Structure 1
Protein backbone atom coordinates (compact mmCIF):
# COMPACT_ATOMS: atom_id res chain seq x y z
CA UNK A 1 0.00 0.00 0.00
CA UNK A 2 2.80 2.35 -1.11
CA UNK A 3 1.47 5.97 -1.29
CA UNK A 4 -0.15 6.30 2.19
CA UNK A 5 1.37 4.87 5.35
CA UNK A 6 -0.23 5.13 8.80
CA UNK A 7 2.39 6.14 11.33
CA UNK A 8 0.36 6.42 14.50
CA UNK A 9 -3.13 5.84 15.96
CA UNK A 10 -4.15 7.13 19.33
CA UNK A 11 -7.50 6.83 21.06
CA UNK A 12 -8.04 10.23 22.69
CA UNK A 13 -10.87 9.31 25.10
CA UNK A 14 -10.39 5.95 26.73
CA UNK A 15 -12.06 4.41 28.67
CA UNK A 16 -15.32 6.19 27.73
CA UNK A 17 -19.06 5.85 28.01
CA UNK A 18 -20.59 3.42 25.47
CA UNK A 19 -22.58 6.42 24.01
CA UNK A 20 -19.57 8.73 23.81
CA UNK A 21 -18.36 9.42 20.24
CA UNK A 22 -15.07 7.78 19.37
CA UNK A 23 -12.01 9.98 18.90
CA UNK A 24 -9.05 8.57 16.97
CA UNK A 25 -5.99 10.77 16.40
CA UNK A 26 -4.25 9.53 13.34
CA UNK A 27 -0.90 10.38 11.88
CA UNK A 28 0.11 9.17 8.44
CA UNK A 29 2.49 10.08 5.67
CA UNK A 30 1.60 10.75 2.08
CA UNK A 31 4.63 9.96 -0.14
CA UNK A 32 3.17 11.23 -3.43
CA UNK A 33 0.32 13.45 -4.66
CA UNK A 34 -3.15 11.88 -4.96
CA UNK A 35 -6.06 12.74 -7.32
CA UNK A 36 -8.73 11.94 -4.78
CA UNK A 37 -9.76 12.03 -1.11
CA UNK A 38 -8.97 9.36 1.49
CA UNK A 39 -12.08 7.71 2.85
CA UNK A 40 -11.80 6.70 6.51
CA UNK A 41 -14.37 4.45 8.18
CA UNK A 42 -15.06 3.09 11.65
CA UNK A 43 -16.99 -0.17 11.98
CA UNK A 44 -18.48 -1.60 15.13
CA UNK A 45 -18.41 -5.43 15.08
CA UNK A 46 -21.04 -6.66 17.49
CA UNK A 47 -20.69 -10.47 17.03
CA UNK A 48 -17.52 -12.51 16.58
CA UNK A 49 -19.47 -15.30 14.80
CA UNK A 50 -21.13 -13.38 11.91
CA UNK A 51 -21.28 -9.95 10.21
CA UNK A 52 -24.99 -9.44 10.69
CA UNK A 53 -24.16 -7.24 13.71
CA UNK A 54 -21.66 -4.92 12.03
CA UNK A 55 -22.43 -1.18 12.07
CA UNK A 56 -20.62 1.38 10.03
CA UNK A 57 -20.31 4.19 12.59
CA UNK A 58 -19.12 6.97 10.30
CA UNK A 59 -17.12 7.51 7.15
CA UNK A 60 -14.88 10.61 6.94
CA UNK A 61 -13.59 12.01 3.59
CA UNK A 62 -10.41 13.94 3.88
CA UNK A 63 -8.49 15.83 1.23
CA UNK A 64 -6.75 17.10 -0.57
CA UNK A 65 -3.85 15.21 0.89
CA UNK A 66 -0.55 17.18 1.02
CA UNK A 67 2.80 15.37 0.78
CA UNK A 68 4.49 14.31 4.01
CA UNK A 69 3.07 14.06 7.54
CA UNK A 70 -0.69 14.56 8.06
CA UNK A 71 -2.50 14.45 11.38
CA UNK A 72 -6.18 14.57 12.08
CA UNK A 73 -8.83 13.49 14.53
CA UNK A 74 -11.50 11.05 13.32
CA UNK A 75 -14.60 11.55 15.56
CA UNK A 76 -17.23 8.88 15.03
CA UNK A 77 -20.74 8.34 16.37
CA UNK A 78 -21.38 5.57 18.93
CA UNK A 79 -23.16 2.29 18.00
CA UNK A 80 -26.97 2.18 17.67
CA UNK A 81 -28.61 -0.08 20.30
CA UNK A 82 -32.14 0.00 18.83
CA UNK A 83 -31.85 -3.26 16.86
CA UNK A 84 -30.30 -5.58 19.47
CA UNK A 85 -32.21 -8.65 20.73
CA UNK A 86 -31.04 -7.54 24.21
CA UNK A 87 -29.00 -4.66 25.52
CA UNK A 88 -26.47 -6.94 27.19
CA UNK A 89 -25.15 -7.72 23.70
CA UNK A 90 -23.04 -4.56 24.09
CA UNK A 91 -21.27 -6.00 27.18
CA UNK A 92 -18.10 -8.10 27.21
CA UNK A 93 -15.59 -8.01 24.38
CA UNK A 94 -16.52 -6.48 21.04
CA UNK A 95 -14.40 -5.18 18.11
CA UNK A 96 -13.92 -1.88 16.31
CA UNK A 97 -12.16 -1.61 12.92
CA UNK A 98 -10.58 1.58 11.65
CA UNK A 99 -9.97 1.47 7.92
CA UNK A 100 -9.01 3.69 5.03
CA UNK A 101 -9.85 3.37 1.37
CA UNK A 102 -8.76 5.21 -1.78
CA UNK A 103 -11.26 5.39 -4.63
CA UNK A 104 -13.41 2.73 -2.91
CA UNK A 105 -10.52 0.28 -2.44
CA UNK A 106 -9.62 -0.48 1.17
CA UNK A 107 -5.84 -0.34 1.68
CA UNK A 108 -5.49 -0.56 5.48
CA UNK A 109 -7.51 -1.85 8.41
CA UNK A 110 -6.64 -1.44 12.06
CA UNK A 111 -8.68 -3.66 14.38
CA UNK A 112 -9.07 -3.42 18.19
CA UNK A 113 -10.70 -5.52 20.90
CA UNK A 114 -12.88 -3.47 23.23
CA UNK A 115 -13.91 -4.45 26.77
CA UNK A 116 -17.34 -3.26 27.91
CA UNK A 117 -18.56 -3.25 31.46
CA UNK A 118 -21.56 -1.90 33.37
CA UNK A 119 -21.30 -0.15 36.71
CA UNK A 120 -22.55 -2.58 39.38
CA UNK A 121 -22.17 -5.83 37.42
CA UNK A 122 -19.51 -8.45 37.46
CA UNK A 123 -19.96 -10.48 34.24
CA UNK A 124 -17.46 -13.20 35.37
CA UNK A 125 -19.81 -14.11 38.23
CA UNK A 126 -22.89 -14.28 36.05
CA UNK A 127 -24.16 -17.25 34.08
CA UNK A 128 -25.20 -16.93 30.45
CA UNK A 129 -28.88 -16.67 31.17
CA UNK A 130 -28.23 -13.93 33.72
CA UNK A 131 -26.18 -11.96 31.22
CA UNK A 132 -28.92 -12.29 28.59
CA UNK A 133 -31.71 -11.01 30.81
CA UNK A 134 -30.06 -8.35 33.03
CA UNK A 135 -31.45 -4.78 32.77
CA UNK A 136 -28.73 -2.68 31.11
CA UNK A 137 -28.56 1.00 31.77
CA UNK A 138 -26.56 2.21 28.76
CA UNK A 139 -25.69 5.38 30.70
CA UNK A 140 -23.63 3.12 33.03
CA UNK A 141 -21.82 1.10 30.37
CA UNK A 142 -18.14 2.00 29.77
CA UNK A 143 -15.98 0.82 26.89
CA UNK A 144 -12.25 0.43 27.08
CA UNK A 145 -10.47 0.00 23.74
CA UNK A 146 -7.42 -2.20 23.92
CA UNK A 147 -5.38 0.39 22.01
CA UNK A 148 -1.92 -1.08 22.64
CA UNK A 149 -2.65 -4.24 20.60
CA UNK A 150 -3.85 -3.17 17.11
CA UNK A 151 -4.33 -5.88 14.49
CA UNK A 152 -3.01 -4.16 11.32
CA UNK A 153 -3.81 -5.47 7.84
CA UNK A 154 -2.62 -3.89 4.59
CA UNK A 155 -4.10 -4.48 1.07
CA UNK A 156 -2.23 -3.64 -2.13
CA UNK A 157 -4.28 -1.25 -4.24
CA UNK A 158 -3.80 0.63 -7.51
CA UNK A 159 -3.71 4.30 -6.42
CA UNK A 160 -3.40 6.60 -9.49
Structure 2
Protein backbone atom coordinates (compact mmCIF):
# COMPACT_ATOMS: atom_id res chain seq x y z
CA UNK A 1 0.00 0.00 0.00
CA UNK A 2 1.28 3.48 -0.99
CA UNK A 3 -1.08 5.11 1.55
CA UNK A 4 -1.44 4.13 5.23
CA UNK A 5 -4.02 5.66 7.56
CA UNK A 6 -2.35 6.25 10.95
CA UNK A 7 -5.32 7.55 12.96
CA UNK A 8 -8.77 9.14 12.89
CA UNK A 9 -9.64 11.53 15.77
CA UNK A 10 -13.38 12.02 16.22
CA UNK A 11 -14.13 15.73 17.06
CA UNK A 12 -17.28 17.51 18.42
CA UNK A 13 -18.53 14.23 19.83
CA UNK A 14 -21.20 13.73 21.16
CA UNK A 15 -23.29 16.33 19.38
CA UNK A 16 -26.90 17.28 18.53
CA UNK A 17 -28.14 15.26 15.53
CA UNK A 18 -28.13 18.45 13.28
CA UNK A 19 -24.50 19.39 14.04
CA UNK A 20 -21.71 18.56 11.55
CA UNK A 21 -19.34 15.54 11.67
CA UNK A 22 -15.64 16.49 12.17
CA UNK A 23 -12.79 13.97 11.85
CA UNK A 24 -9.05 14.72 12.06
CA UNK A 25 -7.35 12.24 9.70
CA UNK A 26 -3.60 11.49 9.75
CA UNK A 27 -2.15 9.42 6.93
CA UNK A 28 1.31 8.50 5.54
CA UNK A 29 2.26 8.41 1.85
CA UNK A 30 5.13 5.89 1.21
CA UNK A 31 5.89 7.40 -2.23
CA UNK A 32 4.57 10.36 -4.36
CA UNK A 33 1.11 9.94 -5.96
CA UNK A 34 0.40 11.52 -9.41
CA UNK A 35 -3.41 11.29 -8.96
CA UNK A 36 -5.74 12.39 -6.11
CA UNK A 37 -7.08 10.47 -3.12
CA UNK A 38 -10.87 10.55 -2.78
CA UNK A 39 -12.27 10.56 0.77
CA UNK A 40 -15.94 10.10 1.64
CA UNK A 41 -18.13 10.19 4.74
CA UNK A 42 -21.10 7.83 4.39
CA UNK A 43 -23.94 7.69 6.97
CA UNK A 44 -25.85 4.40 7.03
CA UNK A 45 -29.43 5.67 7.53
CA UNK A 46 -30.72 2.08 7.86
CA UNK A 47 -29.18 -1.31 8.80
CA UNK A 48 -32.06 -2.85 6.70
CA UNK A 49 -31.10 -1.41 3.30
CA UNK A 50 -28.20 0.31 1.49
CA UNK A 51 -31.02 2.42 -0.14
CA UNK A 52 -30.73 4.63 3.00
CA UNK A 53 -27.02 5.39 2.82
CA UNK A 54 -26.25 9.11 2.63
CA UNK A 55 -22.88 10.30 1.22
CA UNK A 56 -22.43 13.32 3.54
CA UNK A 57 -19.30 14.68 1.90
CA UNK A 58 -16.68 13.75 -0.60
CA UNK A 59 -13.23 15.37 -0.93
CA UNK A 60 -10.23 15.21 -3.31
CA UNK A 61 -6.82 15.33 -1.56
CA UNK A 62 -3.74 15.73 -3.80
CA UNK A 63 -1.26 15.67 -5.49
CA UNK A 64 0.10 13.71 -2.53
CA UNK A 65 3.90 13.77 -1.98
CA UNK A 66 5.66 11.15 0.20
CA UNK A 67 5.48 11.78 3.96
CA UNK A 68 2.98 12.28 6.80
CA UNK A 69 -0.25 14.24 6.06
CA UNK A 70 -3.17 15.57 8.20
CA UNK A 71 -6.51 17.19 7.43
CA UNK A 72 -9.87 17.86 9.13
CA UNK A 73 -12.71 16.20 7.23
CA UNK A 74 -16.05 17.87 7.92
CA UNK A 75 -19.49 16.82 6.78
CA UNK A 76 -23.00 18.16 7.28
CA UNK A 77 -25.52 16.15 9.32
CA UNK A 78 -27.67 13.53 7.51
CA UNK A 79 -31.04 14.56 6.13
CA UNK A 80 -33.69 13.22 8.62
CA UNK A 81 -36.33 13.01 5.86
CA UNK A 82 -34.41 10.08 4.33
CA UNK A 83 -33.99 8.16 7.64
CA UNK A 84 -36.67 5.47 8.35
CA UNK A 85 -38.47 6.01 11.70
CA UNK A 86 -37.56 2.47 12.93
CA UNK A 87 -33.81 3.24 12.53
CA UNK A 88 -33.63 6.85 13.81
CA UNK A 89 -33.26 5.98 17.53
CA UNK A 90 -30.66 3.39 18.44
CA UNK A 91 -27.39 2.29 16.94
CA UNK A 92 -26.27 2.77 13.33
CA UNK A 93 -22.94 3.13 11.46
CA UNK A 94 -20.85 6.03 9.94
CA UNK A 95 -18.11 5.19 7.38
CA UNK A 96 -14.98 6.90 6.14
CA UNK A 97 -13.65 5.47 2.88
CA UNK A 98 -10.70 6.45 0.67
CA UNK A 99 -10.20 5.45 -2.99
CA UNK A 100 -7.12 5.76 -5.25
CA UNK A 101 -8.02 5.63 -8.97
CA UNK A 102 -11.59 4.47 -8.16
CA UNK A 103 -10.42 1.60 -5.87
CA UNK A 104 -11.29 1.52 -2.14
CA UNK A 105 -8.14 0.65 -0.07
CA UNK A 106 -9.38 1.68 3.39
CA UNK A 107 -12.76 1.77 5.18
CA UNK A 108 -13.01 3.11 8.72
CA UNK A 109 -16.37 2.37 10.42
CA UNK A 110 -17.76 3.68 13.70
CA UNK A 111 -20.87 2.58 15.54
CA UNK A 112 -23.06 5.62 16.26
CA UNK A 113 -25.60 5.74 19.03
CA UNK A 114 -28.51 8.21 18.48
CA UNK A 115 -30.52 8.71 21.66
CA UNK A 116 -32.64 11.24 23.46
CA UNK A 117 -30.94 12.78 26.49
CA UNK A 118 -34.24 13.59 28.26
CA UNK A 119 -35.30 10.70 30.62
CA UNK A 120 -38.88 11.36 29.40
CA UNK A 121 -38.20 10.91 25.65
CA UNK A 122 -35.72 8.01 26.35
CA UNK A 123 -38.39 5.97 28.22
CA UNK A 124 -41.30 6.97 25.89
CA UNK A 125 -39.83 7.63 22.39
CA UNK A 126 -42.32 9.46 20.06
CA UNK A 127 -43.60 7.43 17.02
CA UNK A 128 -42.33 10.23 14.74
CA UNK A 129 -38.66 10.73 15.86
CA UNK A 130 -37.81 14.14 17.28
CA UNK A 131 -34.43 14.77 15.53
CA UNK A 132 -33.98 18.22 17.21
CA UNK A 133 -33.75 16.33 20.58
CA UNK A 134 -31.55 13.43 19.41
CA UNK A 135 -27.91 13.28 20.46
CA UNK A 136 -25.41 11.53 18.20
CA UNK A 137 -22.63 9.72 20.12
CA UNK A 138 -20.00 8.16 17.88
CA UNK A 139 -18.23 5.25 19.61
CA UNK A 140 -14.76 6.77 18.97
CA UNK A 141 -13.06 4.27 21.33
CA UNK A 142 -13.83 1.42 18.89
CA UNK A 143 -12.77 2.30 15.27
CA UNK A 144 -13.34 -0.73 12.96
CA UNK A 145 -10.64 -0.54 10.29
CA UNK A 146 -10.70 -2.53 7.08
CA UNK A 147 -7.92 -2.56 4.49
CA UNK A 148 -8.35 -3.88 0.88
CA UNK A 149 -5.70 -4.95 -1.66
CA UNK A 150 -5.75 -2.44 -4.59
CA UNK A 151 -3.72 -1.75 -7.75
CA UNK A 152 -1.44 1.21 -6.83
CA UNK A 153 -0.09 1.37 -10.48
Provide the rounded CA distance (Å) in 2 between the counterparts of 1:140 and 1:64.
42
Residue 107 (structure 1) aligns with: 105
Structure 1 residue 50 displacement after superposition: 2.2
Aligned counterpart, 1:49 = 48
For 2:152, the equivalent position in structure 1 comes to 159
**5+ long unaligned stretches in structure 2:** none
Pick closer, same or farther for the CA change 1:67–1:82 going to 2, 3 Å. same
Measured at CA, do residues 85 and 100 of structure 1 come closer, stay the same or move farther in structure 2, by a change above 3 Å? closer
User: Helix, strand or coil: the match of 1:52?
Assistant: helix
The Cα offsets for residues 56-114 of structure 1, whole Å up to 9 and x where unpaired, read as 1111111111211100000011111123443x632110100111001111100000100
CA–CA separation in structure 2 for the residues paired with 1:84 and 1:137: 12
Q: For residue 8 of structure 1, report the CA deviation from its aligned partner.
A: 0.7
- Which runs of at least 4 in structure 1 moved beyond 3 Å after TM superposition? none
Counting matched residue pairs gives: 151
Q: Which has the higher strand share?
A: 2
Give the SS at the match of 1:139: helix
Normalised by the size of structure 1, how large is the TM-score? 0.87
Report the TM-score when normalising by structure 2: 0.91
Q: Please list, as runs of the form range in 1=range in 2, the aligned pairs for 1:3-152 lying within 5 A after superposition.
A: 3-86=2-85, 89-120=87-118, 121-122=121-122, 125-126=123-124, 131=125, 133=127, 135-152=128-145
